[PDB]
Structures are given as C-alpha cells and as structure tokens.
C-alpha cells in the first residue's frame, strides 16, 4: 500500500502463474478459498469500512520534527561547554539515524532471502553487497567506542584512522 515508500522498500513485480486445471475432479482449495472469502473477508471489510467512515469525520494531523544543523565537535573550543553540548546532541541524533539506516538494509536482506526461495544464494547477491558496504561504513564509524562513547572519542578514532591511511599512502607513493 501507500503507507510506506516503495523505493526505500523495493519489491519484484510479482509475476504469478495462471491456473491450468488438468483433472475433472474439483479443486478443494478453490472451494475452501471461496468459503473463507464469503465468511471472513466480507464482515472484516464491512467493519473496516465502518471504522474508516468514523475516522474520516475526525481528521487531524501530526508533523515530523525538523532539526537544524549546529557546529560539529571539530569547530568546538577546548572548554566551550555549550558548543560541546550542542555538538554532542547532534552526534547522538546522527548515530541513531545511522543505526536506523543499517536496520532498513537488514530488512531488505531478510525479506529477499525468503522471497527468492531456493535461488536466494544467487538472487540475493545485490542485497548482500549493499549490507556489506553499509556494515563496513558503520563499523568504521562507531565500533569499538564502547560505553561512555562521545563525539570526542569518535573524532579521535577518525583522526587515528586518517593518520594511518596517510602514512600508508605516503609509504606506497615512495614505492
């Protein structure tokens, strides 16, 4: 349905075969499907119609909260407590957003493996690559910070990583 964006959660175009009977015997699956429809799906549909009609007479809205961007921990002085507080809050919100991104990618992977059936090892290769990339980025960002993590510790980790890669690049250049 339109409840969620179909680009964030993509699906195949749902090809299904037409029913080709080959026996003069009746198909009890179809008969039970008709019984279930007539006995379950209609009263449920009517109750839903009533509930939606009641809801339409009282329509109100809730809004998504927008946060502006404040200076990061890099642009913070040593003891400027207020700027550090704002940067730390911004960092925590970004961390939560990144966690949710990884969760979305994992949902994509899980749904695909089940949907594919017996060809998941070949069919699901695209999902697996995306998860590997995002997992690598997340691990480079936030892993090994431990409890009592902060923006300063993430900044220190990033500085150490860039120092190491700069040294490696300079040593490879002289080769």
């Amino acid at each position: 349905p339109d409840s969620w964006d179909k680009d964030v959660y993509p699906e195949p175009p749902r090809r299904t075969p037409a029913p080709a009977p080959q026996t003069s015997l009746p198909n009890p699956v179809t008969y039970l499907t008709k019984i279930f429809d007539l006995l379950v799906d209609r009263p449920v549909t009517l109750a839903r119609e009533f509930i939606e009609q009641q809801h339409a007479k009282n329509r109100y809205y809730y809004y998504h909260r927008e946060f502006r961007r404040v200076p990061d921990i890099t642009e913070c002085e040593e003891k400027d407590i207020l700027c550090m507080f704002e940067a730390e809050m911004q960092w925590r919100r970004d961390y939560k957003v990144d966690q949710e991104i990884v969760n979305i990618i994992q949902e994509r992977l899980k749904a695909c493996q089940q949907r594919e059936g017996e060809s998941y090892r070949q069919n699901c290769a695209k999902e697996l690559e995306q998860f590997t990339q995002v997992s690598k980025a997340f691990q480079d960002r936030y892993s090994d910070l431990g409890a009592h993590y902060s923006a300063r510790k993430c900044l220190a980790k990033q500085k150490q990583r860039m120092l190491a890669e700069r040294k490696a690049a300079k040593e490879a250049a002289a080769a």
Partner: protein, 62 residues
C-alpha cells in the same frame, strides 16, 4: 446452543486475526513475506499476460 462452539471458538478468532493481519500487520513493509510461486514452461502470467516458452525440443528417448 448446539453449534455455538464453532462461533465463539473459531469464527471470532479468525475474524480478529484476519482484521489484524489485513489492516495492521500489512500496513508496514516486509511484515508478511511469501516466497515467489514456481514458474514452469508453458505457463501464463496473470498480471502481464506473458506466456513462458516451451522447453528446448526434448530428445524424446522413448
């Protein structure tokens, strides 16, 4: 009184579960995932109408 058992123990729970799955569980993506149906040669797709070609002229080892 005779067949009230099938109403208060089968029909009501299935109504509630059908409501909950159709309008609440389905409302979120990737909550009910079914594996794709098997496609065999000689089949016709319901939506697109495309027909699947036959299978490469069997050697017919009769």
């Amino acid at each position: 009184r005779h067949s009230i058992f099938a109403v208060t123990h089968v029909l009501i729970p299935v109504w509630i579960i059908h409501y909950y799955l159709k309008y609440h569980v389905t409302a979120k993506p990737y909550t009910v995932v079914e594996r794709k149906p098997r496609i065999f040669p000689g089949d016709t797709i319901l939506e697109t109408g495309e027909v699947i070609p036959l299978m490469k002229e069997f050697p017919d080892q009769h």
